[PDB]
Structure 1
Amino acid sequence: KKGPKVTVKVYFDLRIGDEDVGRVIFGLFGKTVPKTVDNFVALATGEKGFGYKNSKFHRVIKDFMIQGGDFTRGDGTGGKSIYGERFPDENFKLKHYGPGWVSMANAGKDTNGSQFFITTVKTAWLDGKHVVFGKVLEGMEVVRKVESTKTDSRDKPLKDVIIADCGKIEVEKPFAIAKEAAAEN
């Protein structure tokens, strides 16, 4: 089986208000989609002042996905990249094969910002519109825990979900992965 090669890994630590529910490890495809992995890694490491630290998930719609990455405004209208404000779509070489595939959220065409979502079920109606650049490697149980928190009519979680930390883990040898669902022990 042929699969994409992962080049960098990033980690998040999540907190639901007061409990620390765990750590999530993403592995990003840097040789397939560069300039989109770079934006994510730069914003995670916080090397330019602004970053994902102390940000929040604002859409936890059940059985669909969890979205976050708006560090400027509380709602889902803010966010900026390192290449200005918005940058164009690169290539749709990968699809949404199942749970745990990370992708870029956009409000039209060529409007990628800094907001991402993690799909929890297979979404084949989104292919060709959103650009996919990663896959969840560890901590699928934490994603499942966050997906089941109580929401409201606008999908804003009643208790806040906070990225209490974010960083970067280096990979010495690129390796391929399977183009299917992930983990789910």
Structure 2
Amino acid sequence: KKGPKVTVKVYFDLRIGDEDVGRVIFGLFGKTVPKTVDNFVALATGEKGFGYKNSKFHRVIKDFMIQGGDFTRGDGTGGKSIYGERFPDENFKLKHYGPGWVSMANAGKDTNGSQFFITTVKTAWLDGKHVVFGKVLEGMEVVRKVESTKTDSRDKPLKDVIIADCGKIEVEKPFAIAKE
């Protein structure tokens, strides 16, 4: 009850190939990292005319993370933010406290676009390099299902892991969560 406040939620409804695998719900920390949260949320709602719906997770590493958000190329080379192709690191106030914490994937300093990690273990080695902005609240078992999927040499799922639907769920009263 001492950690960051969840100010808004996002859902993803996921499929692996032609299998419906369920819903993941994230809580996002809009008081801590509003710019980074606003990007992720808008990409989830598709409200700028582009975003995560119909896109695929392109990298899965068991006992590390699953990575998605490249809705332009589906391979890690693409993606774009609501702020243009790339935007700077907002802050590093939050750490990767435990499994299910969500941060921006990047290509170095100030190269945030649309790609994100959903961590599946505590990933302290990402602290200070990747902007942490949310965490899984519900559907960690769906994350685990994706985490276990078979992959190619690029660690890309053999069967497309598709965000079949996504959007936001409003939070009337922001609530603090534990840093774990």
How many residues end up aligned between the 2 structures?
A: 180
Spell out, residue by residue over 1:123-177, the C-alpha distance to the aligned partner (whole angstroms, 9 max, x if none). Answer: 1111111110001000011111110011122111111110000011111001100
Amino-acid identity (%) = 99
**Structure 2 segments unaligned to the other structure (5+ residues):** none
> CA shift at 1:26, angstroms?
0.3
The alignment yields a C-alpha RMSD, in angstroms, of 1.4
- Cα contact 2:57–2:74 (8 A) shared by 1: no
* Partner Cα distance (2:123, 2:51) in 1: 28
Spell out, residue by residue over 1:39-83, the C-alpha distance to the aligned partner (whole angstroms, 9 max, x if none). Answer: 111111111111101000010112110001011113211111111
Spell out, residue by residue over 1:87-135, the C-alpha distance to the aligned partner (whole angstroms, 9 max, x if none). Answer: 1111111111111000001101111110001111111111111110001
Give secondary structure in 2 for the equivalent of 1:175. Answer: strand
- Cα contact 2:71–2:79 (8 A) shared by 1: yes
- Cα contact 2:81–2:113 (8 A) shared by 1: yes
**Structure 1 segments unaligned to the other structure (5+ residues):** 180-184
| TM-score, normalised via structure 1 length | 0.94
Moved over 4 A (4+): none
| TM-score, normalised via structure 2 length | 0.97
* Partner Cα distance (1:11, 1:45) in 2: 9
Give secondary structure in 2 for the equivalent of 1:146. Answer: helix
> CA shift at 1:3, angstroms?
1.2
